[PDB]
Amino acid sequence: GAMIRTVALVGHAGSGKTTLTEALLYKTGAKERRGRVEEGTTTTDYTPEAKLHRTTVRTGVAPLLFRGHRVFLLDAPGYGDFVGEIRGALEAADAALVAVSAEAGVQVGTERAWTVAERLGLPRMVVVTKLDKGGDYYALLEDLRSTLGPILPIDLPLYEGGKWVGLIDVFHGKAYRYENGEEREAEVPPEERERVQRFRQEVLEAIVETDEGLLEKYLEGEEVTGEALEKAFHEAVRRGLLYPVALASGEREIGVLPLLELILEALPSPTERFGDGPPLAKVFKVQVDPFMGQVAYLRLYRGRLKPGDSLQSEAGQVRLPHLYVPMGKDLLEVEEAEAGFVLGVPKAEGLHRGMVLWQGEKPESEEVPFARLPDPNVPVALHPKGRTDEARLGEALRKLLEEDPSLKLERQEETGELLLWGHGELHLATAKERLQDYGVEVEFSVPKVPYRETIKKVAEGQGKYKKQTGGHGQYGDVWLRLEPASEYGFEWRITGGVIPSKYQEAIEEGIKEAAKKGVLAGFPVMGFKAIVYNGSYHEVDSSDLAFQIAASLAFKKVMAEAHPVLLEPIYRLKVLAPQERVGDVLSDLQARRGRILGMEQEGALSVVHAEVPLAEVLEYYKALPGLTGGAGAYTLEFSHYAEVPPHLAQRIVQERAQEG
Numbered sequence: 001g002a003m004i005r006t007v008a009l010v011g012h013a014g015s016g017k018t019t020l021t022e023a024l025l026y027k028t029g030a031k032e033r034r035g036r037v038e039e040g041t042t043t044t045d046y047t048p049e050a051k052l053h054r055t056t057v058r059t060g061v062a063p064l065l066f067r068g069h070r071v072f073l074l075d076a077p078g079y080g081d082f083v084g085e086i087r088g089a090l091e092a093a094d095a096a097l098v099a100v101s102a103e104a105g106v107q108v109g110t111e112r113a114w115t116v117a118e119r120l121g122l123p124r125m126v127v128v129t130k131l132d133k134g135g136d137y138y139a140l141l142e143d144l145r146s147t148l149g150p151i152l153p154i155d156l157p158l159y160e161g162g163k164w165v166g167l168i169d170v171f172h173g174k175a176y177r178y179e180n181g182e183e184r185e186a187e188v189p190p191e192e193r194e195r196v197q198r199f200r201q202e203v204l205e206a207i208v209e210t211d212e213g214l215l216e217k218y219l220e221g222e223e224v225t226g227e228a229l230e231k232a233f234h235e236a237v238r239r240g241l242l243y244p245v246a247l248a249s250g251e252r253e254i255g256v257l258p259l260l261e262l263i264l265e266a267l268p269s270p271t272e273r274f275g276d277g278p279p280l281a282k283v284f285k286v287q288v289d290p291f292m293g294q295v296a297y298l299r300l301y302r303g304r305l306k307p308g309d310s311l312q313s314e315a316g317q318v319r320l321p322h323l324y325v326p327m328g329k330d331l332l333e334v335e336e337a338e339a340g341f342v343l344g345v346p347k348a349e350g351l352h353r354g355m356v357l358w359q360g361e362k363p364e365s366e367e368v369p370f371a372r373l374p375d376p377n378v379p380v381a382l383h384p385k386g387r388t389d390e391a392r393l394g395e396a397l398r399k400l401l402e403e404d405p406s407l408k409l410e411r412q413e414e415t416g417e418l419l420l421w422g423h424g425e426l427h428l429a430t431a432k433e434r435l436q437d438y439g440v441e442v443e444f445s446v447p448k449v450p451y452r453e454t455i456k457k458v459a460e461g462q463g464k465y466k467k468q469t470g471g472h473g474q475y476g477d478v479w480l481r482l483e484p485a486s487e488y489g490f491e492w493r494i495t496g497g498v499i500p501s502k503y504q505e506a507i508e509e510g511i512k513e514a515a516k517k518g519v520l521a522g523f524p525v526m527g528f529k530a531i532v533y534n535g536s537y538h539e540v541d542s543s544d545l546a547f548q549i550a551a552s553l554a555f556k557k558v559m560a561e562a563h564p565v566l567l568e569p570i571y572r573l574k575v576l577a578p579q580e581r582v583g584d585v586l587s588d589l590q591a592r593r594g595r596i597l598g599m600e601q602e603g604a605l606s607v608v609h610a611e612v613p614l615a616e617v618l619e620y621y622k623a624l625p626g627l628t629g630g631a632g633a634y635t636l637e638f639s640h641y642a643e644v645p646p647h648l649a650q651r652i653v654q655e656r657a658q659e660g
């Protein structure tokens with residue numbers, strides 16, 4: 001009676017998620033006509049980026065109304081590039097509907113969605129799409145069984161002359177065919193009956209075994225009622241003990257409403273997950289429309305709300321004079337909201353992704369669903385195209401990051417460049433396009449490498465600053481010795497009190513400042529001991545400034561005779577390529593001045609450890625997926641610095657010097 005469900009539709013790119021979402025919206029009456037991704041007419045993919053790349057860049061909300069029941073379906077993206085939106089959609093749902101292309105089977109995007117859902121403690125259901133494009137359903141079920149585990153087949157495909165035309169409801173022993181956008185009951189083909197009965201028995205047994213009460217009856221001799229089985233089934237799915245497997249296609253228009261009925265029957269309600277109590281909500285995503293402003297998307301996990309109500313938040317009281325349910329980019333006004341509802345809050349400049357909202361006692365960390373986002377690992381130096389852009393780029397980035405916090409903006413300490421980190425070439429491309437939607441043109445470039453300097457031999461020298469400008473003068477005198485070393489260190493070796501200990505901080509600051517720009521090529525210096533072993537001061541003219549200057553003057557003089565050497569960053573790779581996709585990964589590193597460190601070949605997938613310079617893998621994200629059959633992801637992490645091979649070393653030194 002007036003049930004509610006919040007479900008995240010996830011899965012690998014191209015598994016027919018958005019097409020299924022369109023079919024659901026159309027078949028329920030929420031939409032006049034079902035659009036197509038190819039034509040850019042769907043409810044989910046409305047932003048310029050989504051339509052341009054023909055992929056779900058942003059999670060779309062599809063509020064489904066069916067016979068009084070409500071299913072708030074979140075149509076999430078498929079590519080790992082949009083992990084931010086994917087993980088947020090799962091954080092917002094009480095269960096995951098995982099689409100699996102029949103012709104491809106479980107893919108990388110399937111495993112990632114599945115794992116995040118499992119960690120969030122969410123029930124899982126699988127929907128098999130694209131059976132009309134090919135694939136063997138029965139072999140697919142076996143693969144899902146061996147890969148996912150306790151799957152539970154709900155549907156089997158109905159075939160007519162080799163053509164997929166419908167489905168067979170295993171449990172009820174009924175078949176349905178579709179044609180002209182119409183569902184009709186059909187007979188279970190004679191040749192299929194024995195197999196269908198086998199699946200039915202296995203389904204009955206799988207459900208009975210998860211319920212102690214039913215296992216007692218089945219054993220005691222008592223009868224198992226249909227209502228008893230339904231309850232056991234629902235509870236088993238709620239606890240993640242069974243994973244229903246449905247068959248549906250928005251393109252072929254097969255099993256669409258049946259999938260909705262199954263969602264209501266199999267997946268849990270907000271109450272079965274959080275129980276009843278005061279309002280509890282969370283902003284799981286944010287959209288910043290170029291014209292409409294910021295809109296916050298909230299998931300109400302518990303409680304009820306009416307227009308005029310308010311919620312507490314870390315940012316203070318949040319009034320909601322108007323309640324809106326989102327449907328794509330549109331906000332539909334409602335007169336009330338119950339747990340399970342997904343709401344859209346306009347003019348939400350003060351609400352950000354991750355903020356918890358509540359009434360009553362403030363929730364503690366464990367009471368709210370949370371899925372951490374991996375740090376973005378693809379950097380690109382950012383540059384406004386021109387004048388106006390450079391000026392509007394500040395506000396444009398603010399909006400971009402509010403809407404997509406999976407993107408990180410940083411200022412390289414050494415290089416000084418403004419870097420934007422994303423999760424892939426595609427993610428960054430959408431970021432670029434989005435900035436353009438905000439009226440700003442930018443261009444990317446490979447980040448400048450943060451080269452460093454060091455010394456190879458010991459050297460000593462004096463640094464002295466003595467001048468008199470005005471009333472009093474300044475005096476600083478320092479003797480410095482530089483020693484090559486693995487780690488930087490300041491060593492105060494002053495004796496006889498020739499320099500008071502109070503100038504130690506100033507002297508070190510001077511050494512550090514000068515070290516910001518080496519003598520060899522103007523890069524930061526590292527790996528050296530700075531030893532202050534003698535000097536002098538004047539009680540009258542000595543000061544921190546004088547010694548900082550004296551110390552700096554000494555560093556530059558001394559480093560010039562310590563045999564400078566140019567260093568470069570060196571990272572370690574941890575590639576993950578399939579069985580025969582290893583002879584292509586270890587073949588690529590050779591052109592990148594690499595070095596193998598190990599290879600964990602276990603079963604099918606075998607890890608491939610390595611070590612390679614940073615200057616050689618700045619755009620290795622534009623290659624790995626195209627060599628590991630796309631079923632592999634590269635990993636780059638800082639290891640240590642090293643001397644730039646004499647060849648390049650000289651080359652690089654020349655450039656930096658050439659101009660300034």
Ligand SMILES: Nc1nc2c(ncn2[C@@H]2O[C@H](COP(=O)(O)OP(=O)(O)OP(=O)(O)O)[C@@H](O)[C@H]2O)c(=O)[nH]1
Nearest residue numbers: 013014015016017018019037055056078130249251
């Ligand atoms: N033959 C066939 N094609 C389908 C089916 N479902 C979707 N397609 C098509 O396959 C493509 C996948 O479409 P979407 O529905 O955009 O897929 P998605 O899984 O939502 O894709 P992403 O948002 O990129 O993760 C589209 O070009 C659809 O026209 C299906 O059941 N059968």
Ligand SMILES: [Mg+2]
Nearest residue numbers: 017018055056
């Ligand atoms: Mg999609």
